[PDB]
Design a protein around this ligand. Sequence first.
Ligand code: 6MS
Ligand code: 6MS
Ligand code: MG
Ligand code: MG
Lengths: 173, 173
Amino acid sequence: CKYDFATSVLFTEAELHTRMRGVAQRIADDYSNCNLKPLENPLVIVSVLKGSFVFTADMVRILGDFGVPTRVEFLRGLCDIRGKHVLVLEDILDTALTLREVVDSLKKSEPASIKTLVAIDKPGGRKIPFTAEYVVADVPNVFVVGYGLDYDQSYREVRDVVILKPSVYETWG
Amino acid sequence: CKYDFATSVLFTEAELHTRMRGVAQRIADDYSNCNLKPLENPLVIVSVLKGSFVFTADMVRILGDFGVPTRVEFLRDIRGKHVLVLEDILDTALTLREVVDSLKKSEPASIKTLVAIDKPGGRKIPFTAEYVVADVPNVFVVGYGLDYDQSYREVRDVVILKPSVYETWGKEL
Ligand SMILES: Nc1nc2c(ncn2CCCCCCP(=O)(O)O)c(=O)[nH]1
Ligand SMILES: Nc1nc2c(ncn2CCCCCCP(=O)(O)O)c(=O)[nH]1
Ligand SMILES: [Mg+2]
Ligand SMILES: [Mg+2]
């Protein structure tokens, strides 16, 4: 493997960006009827979990390439969402307990609409039923780091999503 | 100009990244005597101002390429840790002065600052960042995380905003 701390590389930065451009085209199509505009009517991006800064930085730039103007809020997102379209971003979706709570909280402010976009979905991890509208990639029952995802606050800066070696968290634990 | 809301492009994404690679080499050299390591001894990145998520996401990935492992904290467990405060824009220096002086109370091993856009003609107190990606004159810019009323952060380049944008939007408000 390319990294001494990883068993294998699951998604390279380039693979993640190819997938994100595919998702951005779908988002551009799906919101084309909304007359989004900078200042007057941006898509409100609500980024959830500290590590999602990486995904959110890349995704809002790709969305801008596809003609979807945004404004960003971080929950790690309350003022001025009534009547606005909201897209909630999260780097990983596993049990879905966080995103369920966030979406329900935001619904109380009566946005025009709310959808979710996740970089890594672990659908085997659910503790409640939950389907994200947009998913960049799926991961099975494996522990990954990279692309914002940490192990004890390290490895968020790895450009790829990789499986962390057991010998790393075993020694550190 | 490729942007109808801008009168000039000052720094492209590519130019910013070239300059960030130059800075990351200097950081790798300057911190070589700190034996930075993931988990045991990461460089602590303290990202200040909401819009700095873009710079921070790119910069921690570039630092990783140069052998400088990080952990990230956001403002808008550090005693004996090296702290590098990141901010997308340095202007009056009032924010960074306050943040640096606050962090010093927690007895970090060292503290330095790294800014993406320095506007040296904006100072209201004396302040020199240790690392600067690019200097901008006294003009109002957006892009690369920098906003006008929460819009245009997703523009990939740092551009001078067209006066008609804020003259007109100013009258909407
Ligand atoms: N970095 C990392 N974290 C993981 C992994 N599997 C589970 N986690 C905790 C996720 C914490 C955030 C909560 C997300 P929800 O509420 O469970 O959907 C994984 O593979 N990698
Ligand atoms: N978007 C944008 N905002 C600007 C610009 N110049 C000043 N600002 C306010 C700065 C906000 C953060 C505070 C930085 P400090 O405390 O003055 O050093 C500029 O050129 N563009
Ligand atoms: Mg955390
Ligand atoms: Mg703000």
